[PDB]
């Protein structure tokens, strides 16, 4: 693409500069370029990829929710007709969001997942696949909605099965996957009981394994554990 002429190492370096500058669209474009070099990503490189796109799509999602709320209020009894503009603009943001998700899913499919043999990498990328299908599901309202939901579920489930076999209960990737799959259950799949049970069992299993950890690992694991607890507090 436009990054084809730039060295892989330079793309990585610039991704890191973009991160420091909070230039997440640039960060994402640099990491897309790096992925497209065809080489596997290191642990640190995976994190750059994920953070870049998380921030880009997160901004889009937040804008979409503002616009969708305004649209929904426009459809209430007693609201003045204001024309097609709110729908149009919501649709514009939606289409851009969908495009970013499709871009990420395309990187995963060509060829990050298929080349990922270690559980760290494979679980990481399958979690991402679940996340971006989840974001597609958040805006879906038509005949593929069920299929999009199932795609998210499938990816998360595969990642869960690997993570349970291959990673300790306190591994940050395993914990973040469980966190996000629980969010899927609660917010997408109409399965709040499943969400709660997953979050509880994940938390408890991790607590039981903290004793095996160094101080640094302990800090990393207890961080995400707190996110699980935050959702449990909100949902119960």
């Amino acid at each position: 693409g436009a990054m084809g002429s730039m060295e892989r190492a330079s793309l990585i370096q610039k991704a890191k500069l973009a991160e420091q500058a909070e230039r997440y669209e640039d960060m994402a474009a640099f990491m897309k370029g790096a992925v497209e070099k065809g080489e596997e990503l290191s642990c640190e490189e995976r994190n750059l990829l994920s953070v870049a796109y998380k921030n880009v799509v997160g901004g889009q999602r937040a804008a979409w929710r503002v616009l969708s709320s305004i649209e929904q209020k426009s459809n209430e009894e007693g609201s003045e007709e204001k024309g097609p503009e709110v729908r149009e603009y919501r649709e514009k943001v939606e289409t851009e969001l969908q495009g970013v998700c499709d871009t990420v899913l395309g990187l995963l499919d060509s060829h990050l997942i298929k080349e990922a043999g270690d559980a760290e990498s494979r679980v990481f990328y399958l979690k991402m696949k679940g996340d971006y299908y989840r974001y597609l599901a958040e805006v879906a309202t038509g005949d593929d909605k069920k299929r999009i939901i199932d795609s998210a579920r499938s990816a998360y489930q595969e990642a869960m099965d690997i993570s349970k076999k291959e990673m300790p209960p306190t591994n940050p990737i395993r914990l973040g996957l469980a966190l996000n799959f629980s969010v899927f259950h609660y917010e997408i799949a109409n399965s709040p009981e499943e969400a709660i049970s997953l979050a509880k069992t994940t938390f408890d299993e991790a607590m039981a394994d903290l004793h095996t950890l160094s101080e640094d690992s302990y800090k990393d694991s207890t961080l995400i554990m707190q996110l699980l607890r935050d959702n449990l507090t909100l949902w119960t």
Binding site: D131, L179, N180, V183, E187, L227, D230, N231
Partner: peptide, 6 residues
Amino acid sequence: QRSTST
């Protein structure tokens, strides 16, 4: 408060 993800 929204659900939290990572």
